[PDB]
RNA sequence: CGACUCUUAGCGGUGGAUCACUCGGCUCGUGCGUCGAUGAAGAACGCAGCUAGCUGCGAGAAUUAAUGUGAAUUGCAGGACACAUUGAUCAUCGACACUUCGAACGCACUUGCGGCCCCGGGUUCCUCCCGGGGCUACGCCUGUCUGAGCGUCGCU
RNA sequence: GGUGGAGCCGCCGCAGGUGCAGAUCUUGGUGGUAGUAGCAAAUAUUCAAACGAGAACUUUGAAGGCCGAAGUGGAGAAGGG
RNA sequence: UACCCACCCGACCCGUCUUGAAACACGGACCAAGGAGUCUAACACGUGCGCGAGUCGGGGGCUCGCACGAAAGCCGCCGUG
RNA sequence: UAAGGCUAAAUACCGGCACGAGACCGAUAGUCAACAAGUACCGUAAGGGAAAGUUGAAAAGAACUUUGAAGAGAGAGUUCA
RNA sequence: CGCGACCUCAGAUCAGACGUGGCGACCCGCUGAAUUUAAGCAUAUUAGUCAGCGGAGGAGAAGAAACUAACCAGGAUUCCCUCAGUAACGGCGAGUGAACAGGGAAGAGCCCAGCGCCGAAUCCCCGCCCCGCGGCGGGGCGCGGGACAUGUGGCGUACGGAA
C-alpha cells in the first residue's frame, strides 16, 4: 500500500506546462493534428459572447 | 558490504517499520473533514469572529527568535486591570485569558493593552435580550453588521 | 375465513381461549389425517390452522400485556418484563435529571457571566 | 508392537462432548474441556492462533440477540410505540 | 453401546435423519446447483463426531 | 519485591535475562491494594487510598470506594462523574493517585517518555514512518 | 452523468441488486409501456404489469398485433406468461414461453381501486414537473 | 402414540384420558431411534381400542 | 497391400489449458460507533404439505400483530379468498413471543436429585400422591429485621 | 481455410505481479512399463432342481467335508452405531 | 520456405557446479497451467526538465455533493525550514 | 507549587454496522472460501483443513418407432447452433 | 442480675439496587523472549515487540506546570509539519538515539481537601395527595424512617479569597 503512488511537480514547471498547452490551442496545425475536426470553424482562438455563461 | 565511497548510513529499519506504517490516503478527505468544521462552527456562532477570540501580541523566546512576535495564548491578568476588563467577563466577550504570564515590561504591557482598548471600540456587543438596557451597542450599530471576521482577529503583523 | 386480528382484538379473553382450543383440537386431527393419507386439501390446512393459533394467541398476550402494563403504569415498583429494555449501557446512562443538574456554584456563574453574542470590526 | 498391534486396544474414551463449546473435547478425567475450558468461567480464546479465533467469534453463530440490536439502533432504539393505525 | 445416555441418543437420532437422499423435486427448483446430497455418512467409513 | 515465576532458576535464554531473586514490580504496593479492593467490589468504583499501618512482612492500605448508584451520588453533581462508564475500574488502568505514579507522567524534562498520551503512545508515534501521500 | 453519492453505478453491484431483488421491488422493474391510445388518454408512460392485463408482443420470435391477455408472472424467473404466446413441446403438451414486460406493450389495463390511484398519482407527478418547468 | 419427548407417564395418562374421553390402565414409553417418544397405552378392559381407533380416525 | 513401427497428415476420444464472461475477493475512502443476568456472545435440538443441505425461525418455531406496499405465490400440489378486500406477496418493523445448554443461577451435571411458596385433582391440608404456577447461584452497596461480644460505658 | 460464438485491435503516450525446459520447482492430467506384477495362510468340493434375460458365485434338496465345546458353538462390555 | 520420403557429408544430451563433462558426477518420464531480482527509506554518481544566490514543500490554509475529484487551482503562505 | 480530582476539540481505528470508489485480481489468480466454506475430510485434542463457477435465450431438456435383460444405440424430434 | 446507649461484628430466599462473560482494530496497566543483529560471541539489538496477562469507549489515555526557559521571554492536552535522524549511548560498534524554540489543526477551562465563615444551611429512605410517567422526575403535605457532630449544605481555593 505504501508504494509511492503519487508524484510531484514544481509549480513553475506545471504553470508553463499550461502555457505550452494553451499556446498550441491556437495553431490549427497542432489542434487539427489531434483529430479535432476544425475545418469549417471561423477562427481558432475561438472567442464567444459572454451571453453563453 | 560497502563499496568505494558512499556515506555510512545508519538507516533505522532493524526494528519493524512494516507493521506500523501510516500511509496518508486520508490526507484529502481529512482536509474536507476539517473544512466542514471551520464551516459549521462559523454558521453555528453566526455573528462571532470565525477565527476565535482576541489573542495578544507576544514575543518569541530563545535569542534567535527575539525579533518575531505572535498570537500568544491569552492576554495576561495584570494587562486587564489597566484596560478595565474583569477577567471572568473577558472570557465571555471573546477576549482570551491566559492567567499565567509574568509581565516584566511596560513596553509590551501597553502595546498589548492597546489591543483591548482597540477591541472594545470596534466591538458590537449584541444585547442579552432584544429589549435590553446598557452597554449593548445600538440598533444602528447592529443592523450594519452580520459580519464574521474571516481570518485572525486584528492580525498581528511583524 | 381467516381468523384475522380484526375480529379478535375487541373480544373477551375467555372467548379467545375457546376459539384457540377449537383450533388446537382441529390441528391434532389434521396430524392424524396426515398419517392416514388424508388429502392435499387437508394437508394445506394444517399450516393455516397452525398460524391461526398464532393469530389467536398473539391477541391474548397482546391484550393481557396492554392491560397489565396499565396497573403498574403510575406505580413505581414494577416488574422486569415491562421495565424499558433499551441496552445495558443505555439503562445505566444517567437519568436525565442527573446530567442537566448543575452545582449551585456553577449556576451562580452561568447567571453573572453568560456569553454574549457579537460580531466585531464595525 | 506399537503400531497396528496397538492401533487395536483403543476402546476407552478421553474426550466427549462439551456442554458450552459443542466440540468433542470434555476431558472426562480432568473435567476441563480444553477447547473453551469449562469450569473456567472465561472462554479460552487465545491471541495466539488467529485462525482458531475466527472459527468462533461474534459473527459465526446466529447472533439471535445481537443481529436485531443493530437493527434497533439504525432506526433509533425507541419502544412502547406502534405506528399510526388505519 | 447399548448403554447410551440421552445426550448421545439425541445425537444419533439427528445424524440418522441427516442421511436421507435429496427429494427429487428439489432438482426442478428454479435456480439449482444441487444434484446429490454430498454430506452423507456410512457407519464404516467416516466414524461420526465421536 | 517480586520474583521471576519460573520453574527453579530456569530463566531460559541469555545471561542478561537471567535473574529472578532480586527484581522489582513496576507498580507500587499501594496500587496493588487499590487493585484488589476494586477487584472485590466490582460493583464499586475505586477512588483513592491512605496508609494505615506496616509490618516487616505486609503493608496495610485502606482504600476509598464508592457506589456509583447511590442516589446520594448520581443526584449530587461533582460526585456524579464516577457513575459514567469511562471510569469503570480506574485502578486497573492506572488512573488512581498511586496507580498513575507508575506510568511516570508529569510535565517537563523528565516526563519525556509519556509525552504523547502515555508511555506506550509515546513510541507508537516515534516508531512509525510518516510515509506521506505525496512524498 | 449520475452524481448523488448514495447511489451506485457499479457494473457488479446493481447486476447483483438484480437477481437478488425481492418481489416487493420486482413489480416496479417488471413494468411495460402503455399503447399510444392509453398513453394519450391517461398521461402515463409505463405501468407495472399485472396478471390479467391485455398485452401486445413487440419484439421476440413471435411479435405480432394479436392482443393476448397475461396469464401469470414469474417474478422469480422474472418474466411473464401470456395467452396464445405458446409453443408445442415434443408430446403435444403446449407450454407458454417467457417474455419481459419491457418487450411488450399494454393495450388494456385492468383497472382497480389500487391501480387507478397510481395512474392519477403518476399523471399528477408528470404534470407537476411540467408546471414546475413552466 | 407418538408423544412429546418431555412427557411423563402421568402426563400421557391425563392426556389420553382428557381427550378420547377414555381411561387408561397403564402407559409404557420408549424413545424411538429418531428421538420420537412412543407410548403404548393399555385401555381398561370395560373399554375397547378397536372402537376408539375409528373415533380418532386411525385404522 | 501380408503384421508391428515411425513420421506426417485425414478424422473418433481425454483432458481439461486458452479465450470470453462473473451475484466473489482485494485494496482505498466516508458515515456512524450496535452486548449482559430484564439475563449476552457462543453451542444443542427442533420446526415446511410434500425438505436431506445451506439459510430463516423457536412449541405462536420456514414465524408472531402492524404499516407500507400493493397481486401473487409457485418444483408440484393445495388452497382461502369475494384482488371494491390489513387485501396475496415482499420490506419494513414498532405490536407479542424467547425449546435446551451457556457468565448458565437451587445442587450437580447422571440428565438425578431437591428445598421452599401458590392454583387444579387428591385432599377436602390428610399428607402424601397426581396435576399446575413463583422462587432458591456467588460478590457487593444503601436501607431493614434478628442477633453476638468479660469492647466502651450508663442506669440499677 | 474451419469453428467459434462476443467482443476486439493499430499508432502516440503513460502503468505493470511481464515473456520458462531446469529449480527430487507448485497444481492438474497422461504415458511407457503393461495388458505387465499380481487375485498362494485354514486339507473340500460334487450333483440335481428352483429362481431367474443371464448361474461355477444365490437358494432347496441330496452327497462328500471341515470347526469340532480351551469352537468357526450360544450371550454380553467398551467400542461400534 | 514447410510434410513424407530418398540420398551424400556433418553429428554425444540438455542444464549445472565446474583447471576439465557425452560423463561410469548430479537435476531432468511427458504435457499443460503457476514460477523467482520485487516495493520503500537512505545515500551516491550519471542524466532529463523548471527556476537560479535560490529554490523548493510540506504540513497547513483558501476554493466540493467529486461524475471526472479523493483530482486541479490558488496562499504577505513562500518561509516558520 | 506537588502528597486530592474532572474535561470537549482536533487525535487512533486490519474488530461491527452502513456505504462510496479503483492504473486491482480476475476462479491453480483473487481471502481458506464466486458454489453445502471455515463446508467435506483428518487428528483423541490443541488444532489441521480441501476440491469444486459457465447448456441454451427457452427445458424448447429426445415425445414416438425400433434394436437391445438392462446399460447403450439407429431413426425421429427439438434447436441459429 | 437485669434493662439501656454506643463500638465492633454476624445472620437474613429481607426492601431496593448492582457486579461478574463476550467483543476485542483502536484504547489503558504490566510482563515479557528468542529467532534475529553485531559476519562468533555473551555486551548491545530484535525491543518493552509476540505470546501471556490484566483493563476501558465511540474513541481510548492526558490536561490546566512543583512546566518551559535564559528571551527584549513564553504559558493545560493531543496531533501534523518542523527541530531532525540532530544533543548523547554504545566490546562509542550494531545500533541506537530524543528533546528545547517556530508554524499550523484544534483549541475552554476548571473543580476538591484544609483555614474559616455561616441553628447541618445538608443528605439519604418511607406514607398521602397535586402534576409528570417507552431514559422515574418535579410540587406540596405529613413528631413516617435513617446518616451526619469521628461532620452533611453555601461561599471559597490561591489567577487570590474571606471578612
Ligand atoms: Mg485557528
Ligand atoms: Mg463548592
Ligand atoms: Mg472400521
Ligand atoms: Mg479446473
Ligand atoms: Mg479455467
Ligand atoms: Mg455485651
Ligand atoms: Mg498488474
Ligand atoms: Mg508460464
Ligand atoms: Mg484340524
Ligand atoms: Mg448371536
Ligand atoms: Mg562450490
Ligand atoms: Mg567416466
Ligand atoms: Mg550435487
Ligand atoms: Mg495536578
Ligand atoms: Mg482523568
Ligand atoms: Mg477522558
Ligand atoms: Mg477452478
Ligand atoms: Mg481459489
Ligand atoms: Mg468447461
Ligand atoms: Mg473453463
Ligand atoms: Mg455452435
Ligand atoms: Mg469486561
Ligand atoms: Mg552469519
Ligand atoms: Mg551472530
Ligand atoms: Mg550462532
Ligand atoms: Mg543481549
Ligand atoms: Mg529495550
Ligand atoms: Mg531501544
Ligand atoms: Mg501482545
Ligand atoms: Mg509544550
Amino acid at each position: 500500500t505504501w508504494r509511492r503512488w503519487h508524484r510531484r511537480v514544481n509549480t513553475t514547471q506545471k504553470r508553463y506546462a499550461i502555457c505550452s498547452a494553451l499556446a498550441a490551442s491556437a495553431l490549427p496545425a497542432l489542434v487539427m493534428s489531434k483529430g479535432h475536426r476544425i475545418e469549417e470553424v471561423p477562427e481558432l482562438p475561438l472567442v464567444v459572447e459572454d451571453k453563453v455563461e | 558490504a560497502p563499496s568505494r565511497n558512499g556515506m555510512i548510513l545508519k538507516p533505522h529499519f532493524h526494528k519493524d517499520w512494516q507493521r506500523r506504517v501510516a500511509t496518508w490516503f486520508n490526507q484529502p478527505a481529512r482536509k474536507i473533514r476539517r473544512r466542514k468544521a471551520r464551516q459549521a462552527k462559523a454558521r453555528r456562532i453566526a455573528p462571532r469572529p470565525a477565527s476565535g477570540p482576541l489573542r495578544p501580541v507576544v514575543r518569541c523566546p530563545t535569542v534567535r527568535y527575539h525579533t518575531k512576535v505572535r498570537a500568544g495564548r491569552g492576554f495576561s491578568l495584570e494587562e486587564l486591570r489597566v484596560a478595565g476588563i474583569h477577567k471572568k467577563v473577558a472570557r465571555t466577550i471573546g477576549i482570551s485569558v491566559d492567567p499565567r504570564r509574568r509581565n516584566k515590561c511596560t513596553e509590551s504591557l501597553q502595546a498589548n493593552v492597546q489591543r483591548l482598548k482597540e477591541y472594545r471600540s470596534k466591538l458590537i456587543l449584541f444585547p442579552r435580550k432584544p429589549s435590553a438596557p446598557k452597554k449593548g451597542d445600538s440598533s444602528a450599530e447592529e443592523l450594519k453588521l452580520a459580519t464574521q471576521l474571516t481570518g485572525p482577529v486584528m492580525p498581528i503583523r511583524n | 375465513a381467516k381468523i384475522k386480528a380484526r375480529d379478535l382484538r375487541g373480544k373477551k379473553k375467555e372467548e379467545l381461549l375457546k376459539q384457540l382450543e377449537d383450533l388446537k383440537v382441529e390441528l391434532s386431527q389434521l396430524r392424524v389425517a396426515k398419517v392416514t393419507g388424508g388429502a392435499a386439501s387437508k394437508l394445506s390446512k394444517i399450516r393455516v390452522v397452525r398460524k391461526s393459533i398464532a393469530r389467536v394467541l398473539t391477541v391474548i398476550n397482546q391484550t393481557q400485556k396492554e392491560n397489565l402494563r396499565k396497573f403498574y403504569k403510575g406505580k413505581k415498583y414494577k416488574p422486569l418484563d415491562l421495565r424499558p429494555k433499551k441496552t445495558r449501557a443505555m439503562r445505566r446512562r444517567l437519568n436525565k435529571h442527573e446530567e442537566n443538574l448543575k452545582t449551585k456554584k456553577q449556576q451562580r456563574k452561568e447567571r453573572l457571566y453568560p456569553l454574549r453574542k457579537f460580531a466585531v470590526k464595525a | 508392537t506399537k503400531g497396528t498391534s496397538s492401533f487395536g486396544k483403543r476402546r476407552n474414551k478421553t474426550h466427549t462432548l462439551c456442554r458450552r463449546c459443542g466440540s468433542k473435547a470434555y476431558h472426562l478425567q480432568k473435567s476441563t474441556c480444553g477447547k473453551c475450558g469449562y469450569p473456567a468461567k472465561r472462554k479460552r480464546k487465545y491471541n495466539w492462533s488467529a485462525k482458531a479465533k475466527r472459527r468462533n467469534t461474534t459473527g459465526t453463530g446466529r447472533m439471535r440477540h445481537l443481529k436485531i440490536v443493530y437493527r434497533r439502533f439504525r432506526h433509533g432504539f425507541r419502544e412502547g410505540i406502534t405506528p399510526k393505525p388505519k | 453401546s447399548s448403554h447410551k445416555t440421552f445426550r448421545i441418543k439425541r445425537f444419533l437420532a439427528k445424524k440418522q435423519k441427516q442421511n436421507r437422499p435429496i427429494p427429487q423435486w428439489i432438482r426442478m427448483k428454479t435456480g439449482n446447483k444441487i444434484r446429490y446430497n454430498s454430506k452423507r455418512r456410512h457407519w464404516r467409513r467416516t466414524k461420526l463426531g465421536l | 519485591g517480586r520474583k521471576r515465576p519460573v520453574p527453579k532458576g530456569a530463566t531460559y535464554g541469555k545471561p542478561v535475562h537471567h535473574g529472578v531473586n532480586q527484581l522489582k514490580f513496576a507498580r507500587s504496593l499501594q496500587s496493588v491494594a487499590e487493585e484488589r479492593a476494586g477487584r472485590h467490589c466490582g460493583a464499586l468504583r475505586v477512588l483513592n487510598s491512605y496508609w494505615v499501618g506496616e509490618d516487616s512482612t505486609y503493608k496495610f492500605f485502606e482504600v476509598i470506594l464508592i457506589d456509583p448508584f447511590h442516589k446520594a451520588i448520581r443526584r449530587n453533581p461533582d460526585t456524579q462523574w464516577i457513575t459514567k462508564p469511562v471510569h469503570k475500574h480506574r485502578e486497573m488502568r492506572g488512573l488512581t493517585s498511586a496507580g498513575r505514579k507508575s506510568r511516570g507522567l508529569g510535565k517537563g524534562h523528565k516526563f519525556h517518555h509519556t509525552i504523547g498520551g502515555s508511555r506506550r503512545a509515546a513510541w507508537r508515534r516515534r516508531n512509525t514512518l510518516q510515509l506521506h501521500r505525496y512524498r | 452523468m449520475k452524481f448523488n453519492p448514495f447511489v451506485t453505478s457499479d457494473r457488479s453491484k446493481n447486476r447483483k441488486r438484480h437477481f437478488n431483488a425481492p418481489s416487493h421491488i420486482r413489480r416496479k422493474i417488471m413494468s411495460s409501456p402503455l399503447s399510444k391510445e392509453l398513453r394519450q388518454k391517461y398521461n402515463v408512460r409505463s405501468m407495472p404489469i399485472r396478471k390479467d392485463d391485455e398485452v401486445q408482443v413487440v419484439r421476440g420470435h413471435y411479435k405480432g398485433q394479436q392482443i393476448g391477455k397475461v396469464v401469470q408472472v414469474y417474478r422469480k424467473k422474472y418474466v411473464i406468461y401470456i395467452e396464445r404466446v405458446q409453443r408445442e413441446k415434443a408430446n403435444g403438451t403446449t407450454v407458454h414461453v417467457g417474455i419481459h414486460p419491457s418487450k411488450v406493450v399494454i393495450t388494456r389495463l385492468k383497472l382497480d381501486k389500487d391501480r387507478k390511484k397510481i395512474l392519477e398519482r403518476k399523471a399528477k407527478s408528470r404534470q407537476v414537473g411540467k408546471e414546475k418547468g413552466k | 402414540f407418538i408423544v412429546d419427548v418431555k412427557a411423563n407417564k402421568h402426563q400421557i395418562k391425563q392426556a389420553v384420558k382428557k381427550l378420547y374421553d377414555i381411561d387408561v390402565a397403564k402407559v409404557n414409553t420408549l424413545i424411538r431411534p429418531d428421538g420420537e417418544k412412543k407410548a403404548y397405552v393399555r385401555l381398561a378392559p370395560d373399554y375397547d381400542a378397536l372402537d376408539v381407533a375409528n373415533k380418532i380416525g386411525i385404522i
Side-chain angles (χ1 to χ4, degrees):
Chain A
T1 333
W2 56 83
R3 178 177 336 257
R4 182 154 86 104
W5 298 122
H6 340 186
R7 225 58 135 220
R8 289 239 48 157
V9 208
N10 301 283
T11 326
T12 52
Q13 278 249 316
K14 75 152 92 74
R15 280 157 169 202
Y16 126 62
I18 293 169
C19 280
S20 30
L22 283 204
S25 85
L27 289 38
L30 307 170
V31 185
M32 286 183 64
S33 193
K34 255 216 185 198
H36 251 57
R37 198 69 276 158
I38 277 163
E39 281 262 47
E40 237 311 291
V41 176
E43 100 212 309
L44 218 207
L46 179 54
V47 188
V48 183
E49 216 97 333
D50 28 288
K51 294 285 185 173
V52 173
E53 290 75 47
Chain B
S3 300
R4 26 145 65 143
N5 274 311
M7 281 179 178
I8 281 298
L9 284 18
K10 309 286 224 290
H12 328 64
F13 291 117
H14 301 224
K15 195 164 282 191
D16 199 87
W17 59 273
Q18 291 235 220
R19 168 154 297 123
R20 302 165 293 264
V21 177
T23 56
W24 273 32
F25 329 117
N26 303 278
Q27 163 81 206
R30 194 138 109 178
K31 232 73 177 288
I32 295 157
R33 288 256 252 47
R34 285 146 179 274
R35 200 135 249 68
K36 290 195 198 307
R38 247 139 274 83
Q39 291 255 291
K41 199 205 182 182
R43 298 166 322 122
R44 145 208 268 209
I45 67 177
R48 232 100 48 90
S51 175
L54 183 66
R55 337 246 5 189
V57 163
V58 144
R59 287 227 182 287
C60 297
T62 60
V63 71
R64 94 137 115 158
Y65 247 159
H66 243 251
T67 64
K68 304 312 174 56
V69 191
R70 267 201 290 188
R73 194 240 209 295
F75 290 78
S76 84
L77 291 165
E78 217 274 9
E79 263 236 293
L80 300 168
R81 105 286 341 255
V82 145
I85 306 181
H86 190 260
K87 69 189 180 84
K88 298 183 188 185
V89 171
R91 283 289 2 265
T92 64
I93 282 168
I95 300 169
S96 305
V97 184
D98 132 65
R100 216 197 341 226
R101 266 172 54 172
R102 135 249 49 264
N103 270 248
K104 308 191 86 169
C105 73
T106 65
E107 276 80 28
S108 80
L109 191 53
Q110 267 67 299
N112 205 200
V113 171
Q114 255 82 337
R115 303 199 71 228
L116 297 160
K117 297 281 189 181
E118 219 293 322
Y119 196 19
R120 271 270 146 264
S121 68
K122 55 146 80 285
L123 178 139
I124 289 71
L125 204 77
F126 238 46
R128 278 252 33 182
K129 297 260 60 62
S131 311
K134 268 63 183 72
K135 316 198 78 59
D137 282 73
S138 67
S139 64
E141 306 185 348
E142 180 95 20
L143 207 77
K144 57 161 73 155
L145 96 172
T147 196
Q148 304 246 30
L149 262 60
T150 328
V153 59
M154 292 195 234
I156 295 164
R157 275 193 339 191
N158 236 309
Chain C
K2 305 200 112 299
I3 304 174
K4 300 167 194 306
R6 286 219 135 248
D7 52 304
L8 305 188
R9 225 61 149 177
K11 289 212 305 181
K12 199 161 283 184
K13 192 263 284 291
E14 60 123 7
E15 182 68 294
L16 296 175
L17 295 169
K18 289 184 196 76
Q19 190 190 91
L20 174 62
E21 190 260 349
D22 238 353
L23 294 159
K24 287 286 186 75
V25 167
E26 186 186 81
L27 206 206
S28 156
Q29 333 197 252
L30 296 167
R31 275 142 193 282
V32 170
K34 179 144 77 180
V35 176
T36 59
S41 56
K42 274 206 166 188
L43 292 171
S44 56
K45 286 204 79 203
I46 194 171
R47 213 171 114 132
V48 176
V49 173
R50 253 139 107 295
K51 300 285 168 213
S52 65
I53 293 159
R55 231 159 321 274
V56 171
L57 271 162
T58 313
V59 174
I60 294 163
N61 305 6
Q62 292 278 317
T63 54
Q64 164 178 103
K65 229 174 181 164
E66 267 36 53
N67 233 187
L68 222 176
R69 75 200 39 234
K70 220 168 289 193
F71 269 158
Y72 314 2
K73 180 260 186 74
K75 289 199 191 74
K76 205 192 313 89
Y77 262 60
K78 80 165 65 175
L80 302 175
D81 289 349
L82 317 180
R83 307 223 57 247
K85 182 191 165 56
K86 327 206 95 170
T87 313
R88 208 146 91 359
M90 206 169 283
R91 300 145 324 143
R92 306 174 181 6
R93 286 162 329 112
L94 283 138
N95 199 87
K96 104 101 75 260
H97 260 319
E98 304 158 39
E99 79 296 309
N100 54 323
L101 259 155
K102 330 208 86 183
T103 317
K104 204 157 61 168
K105 186 160 182 179
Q106 222 203 302
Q107 306 192 214
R108 198 207 170 312
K109 288 177 185 180
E110 282 158 89
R111 192 168 318 120
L112 294 184
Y113 300 117
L115 296 71
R116 299 299 134 270
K117 183 172 159 95
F118 16 8
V120 305
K121 124 175 238 67
Chain D
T1 76
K2 40 207 197 174
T4 300
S5 186
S6 298
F7 294 83
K9 59 236 289 167
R10 318 196 41 90
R11 98 193 51 261
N12 44 297
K13 306 215 149 163
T14 40
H15 297 281
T16 193
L17 293 152
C18 182
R19 50 152 45 77
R20 195 151 68 99
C21 307
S23 71
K24 197 277 213 87
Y26 234 115
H27 222 186
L28 293 168
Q29 290 189 34
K30 290 200 298 167
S31 73
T32 54
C33 165
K35 187 175 181 55
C36 73
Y38 201 17
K41 225 152 281 166
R42 305 173 173 289
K43 187 198 276 184
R44 191 216 30 193
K45 78 173 283 299
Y46 211 21
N47 234 175
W48 170 86
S49 72
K51 189 157 212 185
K53 220 157 54 176
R54 106 191 108 67
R55 287 210 215 49
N56 20 42
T57 39
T58 44
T60 58
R62 283 173 65 169
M63 307 210 296
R64 69 194 281 199
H65 191 69
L66 211 70
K67 78 211 291 290
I68 71 147
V69 176
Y70 331 53
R71 160 136 76 100
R72 224 193 322 253
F73 165 79
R74 206 197 321 283
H75 160 42
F77 273 123
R78 99 235 31 68
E79 27 228 306
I81 199 73
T82 182
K84 179 184 73 172
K86 296 148 93 275
Chain E
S1 199
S2 201
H3 293 138
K4 307 168 209 289
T5 62
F6 190 92
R7 297 186 101 209
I8 293 292
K9 208 179 194 190
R10 268 216 327 268
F11 227 9
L12 306 137
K14 189 194 184 74
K15 255 74 256 282
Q16 224 226 47
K17 292 181 286 193
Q18 291 196 49
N19 276 334
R20 47 125 300 106
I22 301 178
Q24 292 157 76
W25 58 244
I26 283 285
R27 316 203 339 109
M28 257 70 71
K29 287 250 205 180
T30 306
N32 260 331
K33 310 190 169 176
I34 283 186
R35 23 274 206 94
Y36 67 97
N37 167 339
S38 213
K39 287 190 186 190
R40 283 193 95 146
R41 185 189 23 67
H42 188 58
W43 27 248
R44 212 83 128 256
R45 18 92 76 140
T46 316
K47 279 283 187 182
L48 238 279
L50 285 167
Chain F
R2 196 247 212 254
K3 144 72 86 87
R4 187 166 304 282
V6 290
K8 309 162 194 190
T11 320
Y12 277 167
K14 297 176 192 180
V16 176
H17 272 20
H18 202 51
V20 40
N21 275 175
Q22 237 238 34
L23 54 91
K24 277 94 187 170
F25 202 84
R27 271 198 306 241
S28 79
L29 294 164
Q30 186 194 127
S31 51
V32 171
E34 299 203 40
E35 216 238 323
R36 301 149 136 191
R39 211 119 178 286
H40 219 297
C41 339
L44 309 197
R45 211 132 320 127
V46 172
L47 191 59
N48 185 339
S49 63
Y50 12 78
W51 178 19
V52 297
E54 122 230 339
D55 180 345
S56 52
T57 41
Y58 320 26
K59 295 178 163 281
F60 293 77
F61 271 69
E62 110 82 59
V63 173
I64 317 157
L65 287 142
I66 302 182
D67 251 41
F69 38 128
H70 243 298
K71 297 296 167 173
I73 286 147
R74 287 260 147 75
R75 298 192 227 201
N76 161 48
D78 279 49
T79 52
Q80 81 182 336
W81 87 187
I82 326 145
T83 58
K84 286 176 180 181
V86 174
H87 303 262
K88 281 185 204 173
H89 322 211
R90 297 156 34 101
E91 81 305 350
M92 307 297 295
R93 295 125 65 111
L95 314 189
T96 60
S97 29
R100 107 218 268 90
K101 289 159 190 188
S102 66
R103 295 146 96 256
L105 0 104
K107 299 186 188 63
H109 80 215
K110 323 167 148 186
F111 309 82
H112 263 292
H113 41 155
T114 87
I115 204 175
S118 54
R119 193 152 270 211
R120 220 138 287 221
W123 106 213
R124 164 185 349 281
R125 194 160 45 112
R126 309 148 123 196
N127 322 174
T128 39
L129 292 175
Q130 264 27 283
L131 291 187
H132 298 195
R133 253 174 67 217
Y134 206 29
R135 305 319 196 68
Chain G
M1 268 308 319
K2 102 164 195 326
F3 284 143
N4 140 3
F6 285 69
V7 179
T8 320
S9 193
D10 193 50
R11 179 60 178 163
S12 61
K13 273 193 204 169
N14 42 335
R15 277 199 44 75
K16 160 98 166 287
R17 228 112 21 66
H18 246 121
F19 341 98
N20 251 314
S23 69
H24 169 79
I25 302 173
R26 286 188 156 149
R27 211 182 97 336
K28 287 161 197 64
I29 294 153
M30 289 195 81
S31 62
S32 71
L34 285 46
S35 57
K36 274 85 265 283
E37 198 213 323
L38 303 188
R39 211 164 83 142
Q40 203 79 27
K41 186 185 78 176
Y42 264 160
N43 218 342
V44 175
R45 177 59 115 96
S46 50
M47 274 304 289
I49 248 180
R50 199 265 209 58
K51 198 177 174 190
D52 77 5
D53 233 48
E54 274 103 19
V55 141
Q56 263 215 195
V57 180
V58 197
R59 327 256 80 211
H61 156 273
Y62 54 125
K63 163 213 310 296
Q65 238 87 104
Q66 294 83 330
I67 295 166
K69 194 197 79 190
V70 173
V71 184
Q72 51 43 190
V73 187
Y74 286 133
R75 301 172 191 268
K76 203 192 174 68
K77 297 195 178 45
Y78 150 59
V79 62
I80 64 161
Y81 248 47
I82 334 187
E83 196 134 17
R84 277 155 297 266
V85 159
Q86 63 197 226
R87 111 192 284 355
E88 205 181 45
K89 215 198 296 195
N91 354 330
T93 48
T94 42
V95 172
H96 324 347
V97 176
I99 306 190
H100 268 327
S102 58
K103 307 303 171 166
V104 125
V105 70
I106 295 167
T107 56
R108 240 195 337 146
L109 294 165
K110 196 256 182 177
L111 303 168
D112 246 308
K113 197 210 305 180
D114 336 320
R115 219 227 200 78
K116 275 171 194 299
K117 64 155 279 175
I118 291 159
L119 269 49
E120 293 221 51
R121 278 207 338 80
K122 288 191 173 186
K124 193 198 76 193
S125 209
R126 149 76 55 20
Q127 74 125 138
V128 157
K130 199 167 70 279
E131 283 285 347
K132 180 262 164 188
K134 183 187 191 292
Chain H
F1 278 75
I2 300 297
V3 158
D4 184 58
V5 77
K6 307 177 210 79
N8 309 80
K9 287 163 186 186
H10 333 302
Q11 294 176 326
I12 295 152
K13 199 243 193 68
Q14 271 40 273
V16 171
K17 189 171 289 183
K18 193 64 163 197
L19 307 177
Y20 321 96
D21 295 353
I22 218 166
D23 89 62
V24 173
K26 62 167 197 180
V27 184
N28 210 335
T29 81
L30 64 87
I31 292 190
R32 292 224 256 73
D34 273 338
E36 281 80 89
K37 168 164 280 178
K38 269 203 292 192
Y40 14 142
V41 186
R42 167 60 138 297
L43 314 171
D46 71 302
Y47 224 43
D48 265 314
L50 201 66
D51 310 51
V52 76
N54 331 343
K55 271 69 168 298
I56 68 167
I58 76 175
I59 207 88

